[model samples]
Target: QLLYPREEMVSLVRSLDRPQENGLFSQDVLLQYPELAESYTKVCPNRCDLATAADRAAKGAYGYDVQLTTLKEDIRLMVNNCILFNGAEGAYADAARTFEKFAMGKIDAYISQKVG
Candidate 1:
């Protein structure tokens, strides 16, 4: 999917500007990390007929299970984990800014990601 964020979302993503700590945002916020090929494990039965999806996510050599249906979507989407600023009332202001900064980093981090 095209990672290019809509102006509104871009504005929102860029709103964050907190200092960095460890490998995460240090402003007391939380956001879901989106990932592709979430494990080579496959959903059995209806989602996948084990033997069939083998090639998709059970090859062993290097397996992966992807939303093939979502692959065809030309419109694209923003599948981000919702972010929350969890902190004390006094820290909320800093949290929000840090949160925006974190989001912007997420956006910027994937600016080089390749997608269709």
Candidate 2:
């Protein structure tokens, strides 16, 4: 949905440069350096699914008509999920910072315009 944080998410997706090989972020890449992760025959589905779970967790944490606070809380929940399987916190922090740095003002504007 356009109402969700798209621009900031784009930045996060673009900044994932660890693996340095096949331009894709995965649990394996984030966990044990992207280059090292390439050694795996294939990333385990169970481990890779953490990201999917995080996305759903955030979506389920908020409703369609959400405000800034709700969105930030959703981000926090996703960050927590990152911590659970991310194996490193910097990636989580960077993603959060990138999101807030680029999108907080826009989200704040949205909250002001939409929230009662």
Candidate 3:
């Protein structure tokens, strides 16, 4: 039996919509800001966006650890890029920090629900 249900895994990944809708973890933001896009490209060449994460979850392409690592790294890169290009005190960086906290909390909740 699978440790995690595929549908539930997909739902977990889709939960990132909170950050994306807030414009903190969105590719559209990068597209709109040329300088940020340039920095983001250098930092995140692989471009692991939420849509791709959800697709992978639905396809069973990610094991639990792999999914967590991928999501964590993606958020880290976003925060780093924002700080690098937008300044640590800027709105983007602040939003990135908030997004990181929210995303991490969701991941923890998912793990607790599955493992407990």
Model 2 TM-score, 2 decimals? 0.33
Taking the tens digit of each residue's C-alpha lDDT, what string does model 2 give over 1-115? 4454545433333333334323223333336566644333243322332244235334543334355354555444444444444444566555545544444565466557644
Tell me which residue pairs clash in candidate 1.
16-100, 16-101, 17-101
TM for candidate 1 is 0.24
lDDT of 3 at 21: 42
lDDT string, candidate 3, 1-116, tens digits = 35667788789878876735464554445556677666667755555556666777798655556346755776676667666657788887777777778878997798788777
Q: Which runs in model 3 stand beyond 4 Å of their true positions?
A: 19-21, 28-46
Ordered from best to worst lDDT, the candidate numbers read 3, 2, 1
In the order shown, the candidates' Cα RMSDs to the true structure are 14.6, 8.6, 3.4
Q: What does the lDDT come to for candidate 1?
A: 0.28
Error of 3 at 53 (Å): 2.1
Residue 65 of model 3 has an lDDT of 63
